[PDB]
Amino acid sequence: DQEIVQMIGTEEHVMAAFGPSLEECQKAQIFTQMQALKYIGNKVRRQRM
Amino acid sequence: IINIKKEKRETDEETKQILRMLPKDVSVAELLRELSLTKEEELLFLQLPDTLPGQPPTQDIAENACTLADLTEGQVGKLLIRKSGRVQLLLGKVTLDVTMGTACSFLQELVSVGLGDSRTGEMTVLGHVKHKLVCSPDFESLLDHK
Amino acid sequence: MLLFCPGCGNGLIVEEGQRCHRFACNTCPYVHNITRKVTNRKYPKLKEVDDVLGGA
Amino acid sequence: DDPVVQEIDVYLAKSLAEKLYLFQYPVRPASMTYDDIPHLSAKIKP
Ligand SMILES: [Zn+2]
């Protein structure tokens, strides 16, 4: 998360605005690329072409 | 309580959240402070232009990429600190311009990977990287030259 | 203020331990006991102006 | 605006040309160093 916060912006209001997103992501137990990829795949529909 | 294993503040220049109770430099200032005030040798990291003003010496070349690797040992360039803070790098006939890179505040350590054996290697940290330099051709000089 | 774990770079959270309250990481055992007071002022902007009306 | 100070010689080296890697930790401020943490293993694919 430190990378993402550094990478969005280091101004105080920036972290203030971005805090709810971090709280939301910590609400779920996503801490690994595998977990988030699984979550996305669940949220991705079979728009079969 | 341990003073060196503390938690971090977001601002790197103000990392020390709790107490025991910054200027932005230019090449002329940087080299002046690191030579005159301090005699200690320092590790720098610089980005050269894509191609150097030379030709690969019998390296099977087409004006291909003449990088730092293709050159040889010995004196290779001259660094001139001009008045009014101007800093240049005379590299023979051409004069590159040297500037501050982005001031990285995180940890950059220059290591050596000495593959002494096929399955053994010497990880040799050499020193921290404090400043980053950028070298670019003075295209204005090249243009008004011709 | 948003504190991040030096051990692994994740966002530290606040919790209560046994001796005192600690900042803790949800991925690694890095914890930091809150040894003394810590504050995070916001200084929200106030309602400065009043703006009576009826001018020309 | 002459080169008023420190006409500096610049040299090239090749002793560690193939042995030199630059490691940077984006998450670790330069304040803290890994010089005190005893390392255990280092696996590399050249
Ligand atoms: Zn952690």
User: By C-alpha distance, which of A1, B17, B6 is closest to C33?
Assistant: B6
CA distances for B43 relative to B109, B131, B133, C25, angstroms:
10, 8, 11, 35
CA distances for B137 relative to B23, B49, D8, angstroms:
27, 7, 19
Write down how long chain B is. Answer: 146
User: By C-alpha distance, which of D31, C13, C25 is closest to B4?
Assistant: D31
User: By C-alpha distance, which of C54, C22, C55 is closest to C38?
Assistant: C22
Inform me whether the C-beta atom of residue B13 falls under 8 Å from chain A C-beta atoms.
Answer: no
- d(C-alpha C31, C-alpha C7), whole Å: 10
- d(C-alpha B126, C-alpha A31), whole Å: 34
- d(C-alpha B87, C-alpha B28), whole Å: 6
Tokens linked to B137: 């051709």
- d(C-alpha B71, C-alpha B135), whole Å: 17
Q: Which residues contact residue C26 at a Cβ distance below 8 angstroms, ignoring those fewer than 6 apart? A: A26, A31, C10, C11, C13
Residue with tokens 């997103």: A21
Is C25 assigned to a binding site? yes
Q: To 10 degrees, the CA torsion angle through B25, B132, B39, D20?
A: 170
Do residues D35 and B126 make contact, with C-beta atoms less than 8 angstroms apart? Answer: no
User: What technique solved it?
Assistant: cryo-EM
Chain C partners within 8 Å of A2 (Cβ): 4-5, 9-11
Interface test mutation site (partner D, options B7, B37, B105, B106, max chain D beta carbons within 10 A):
B106
How many helices, marked H, and strands, marked E, lie in chain A? 3, 0
Inform me whether the C-beta atom of residue B10 falls under 8 Å from chain A C-beta atoms.
Answer: yes
- d(C-alpha B87, C-alpha D2), whole Å: 10
Residue B96, H or E segment: strand B95-100
- d(C-alpha D28, C-alpha C10), whole Å: 12
